[PDB]
Structures are given as structure tokens and as C-alpha cells.
From a paper:
The Type-IV restriction endonuclease (REase)ScoA3McrA (abbreviated as ScoMcrA hereafter) catalyzes multiple double strand cleavages 16–28 nucleotides (nt) away from the phosphorothioate linkage with the core sequence GPSGCC/GPSGCC. The DNA PT-dependent REase ScoMcrA distinguishes PT-DNA from normal DNA which differs only by one oxygen-to-sulfur swap, and presumably encodes a domain to specifically recognize sulfur on PT-DNA. The uncharacterized domain binds specifically to PT-DNA whose sulfur atom is in the Rp but not in the Sp configuration, therefore we named it sulfur-binding domain (SBD).
Although there are sulfur atoms in both strands of PT-DNA, which contain a palindromic GPSGCC core sequence, only one sulfur atom in PT-DNA is recognized by ScoMcrA-SBD in both structures. The hydrophobic pyrolidine ring of P165 forms the bottom of this sulfur-binding cavity. Our structure reveals that the tip of the α9–α10 loop of ScoMcrA, whose sequence is S187RGRR191, inserts into the major groove of PT-DNA and provides base-specific contacts for the GPSGCC core sequence. Hence, the association with PT-DNA leads to a 98° rotation of the hydroxyphenyl group from Y164 side-chain.
Numbering used by the authors: 94 to 251
The structure:
DNA sequence: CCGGCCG
DNA sequence: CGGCCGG
């Protein structure tokens, strides 16, 4: 079974002219910061949307952060990095690619890291640091002022 | 294909 | 929304 480090490194978003899609990298970094702060592992869509949307806009180059967050909130399930509760309650669109924003808002499913991954992050902070550093090196190589603080990773990345 | 893009 | 683009 693949390590969390390996699963995170297998996330390879499409590279456009402007750069790779930063959606998955931003949600993963946020989720690592959440585990490190011992926030609950599963968090509602509404809470996650509200936390992550402005980071998506500021650090992820997205125009609409809400519209932005919904893509990795679902797509990370396929990358074996994420769990969405009540998934079978959602309405899918676009040939099964994704849930509608309307059904995400209505059902307000909880989601987050897999239990084994979340438990690893809390128990082995060195493993959290290396996973978050890996994402930062690959996608935020010019490291924006504010990024570590805004993702909750300042103390972690000592 | 399948995850972001864009009529 | 949901079909489209293209890495």
C-alpha cells in the first residue's frame, strides 16, 4: 500500500501556460495544517469552502475560490488522499465527473484526509513537515509572504 | 481519460 | 449546468 508521501507526490496536476492547476496542492497543504492543529479530521463542505476559498484566490491564482475549492474537494478521493461522507447523496454532473455545487451546498457533506494519514500527521510531525515541504518546493517554490502563516504551517516548518 | 475550463 | 479541452 502506497505511503502518504508517495500518494501526495503522485498528484501531478495539468500544466497550463500560466502553470499547474494549484487546486489540489492548496487543499492538501490546508489539510496538513489542519491535522497539525488537531482540527477534526472530517469537516463540513461549508467550513472547508469558507476556509480554503480565500487561499485558493490569494495563493492558487483562481478567480473564484468557491468555484475553485469544489474541484479538489472531490477529485482528491480519486487520488486516494481524501474521504467524502454521504457521497452517494450528492447529485453528479458532467458524466459523473463531479457533484453539483447545489448538491454540495444542500447535503453539506463532511470530508477530509483518510484516518491512517491523519493519524500519521498528528503522530509523526516530521512526516507532516516533509509532505508539506514537498508540496511547497514543487508548487510554491517562490514562497509567498504569508503562505506559512495562512496555511498554519509556520511552526511546523521550523 | 478526467480535472479544471468555458459556451 | 454540463459539454469541452488538452496535459
Amino acid at each position: 500500500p502506497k505511503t502518504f508521501h508517495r500518494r501526495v507526490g503522485d498528484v501531478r496536476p495539468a500544466r497550463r501556460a500560466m502553470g499547474p492547476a494549484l487546486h489540489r496542492p492548496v487543499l492538501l497543504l490546508w489539510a496538513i495544517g489542519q491535522a497539525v492543529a488537531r482540527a477534526p479530521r472530517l469537516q463540513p463542505w461549508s467550513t472547508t469552502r469558507d476556509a480554503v476559498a480565500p487561499l485558493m484566490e490569494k495563493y492558487g491564482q483562481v478567480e473564484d475560490g468557491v468555484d475553485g475549492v469544489r474541484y479538489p474537494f472531490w477529485a482528491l478521493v480519486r487520488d486516494d488522499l481524501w474521504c467524502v461522507e454521504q457521497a452517494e447523496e450528492l447529485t453528479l454532473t458532467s458524466r459523473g465527473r463531479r457533484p453539483t455545487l447545489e448538491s454540495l451546498n444542500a447535503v453539506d457533506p463532511s470530508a477530509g484526509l483518510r484516518e491512517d494519514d491523519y493519524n500519521l500527521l498528528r503522530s509523526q510531525p516530521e512526516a507532516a513537515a516533509s509532505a508539506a515541504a514537498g508540496l511547497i518546493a514543487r508548487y510554491f517554490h517562490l514562497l509567498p509572504a504569508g503562505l506559512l502563516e495562512d496555511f498554519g504551517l509556520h511552526e511546523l516548518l521550523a
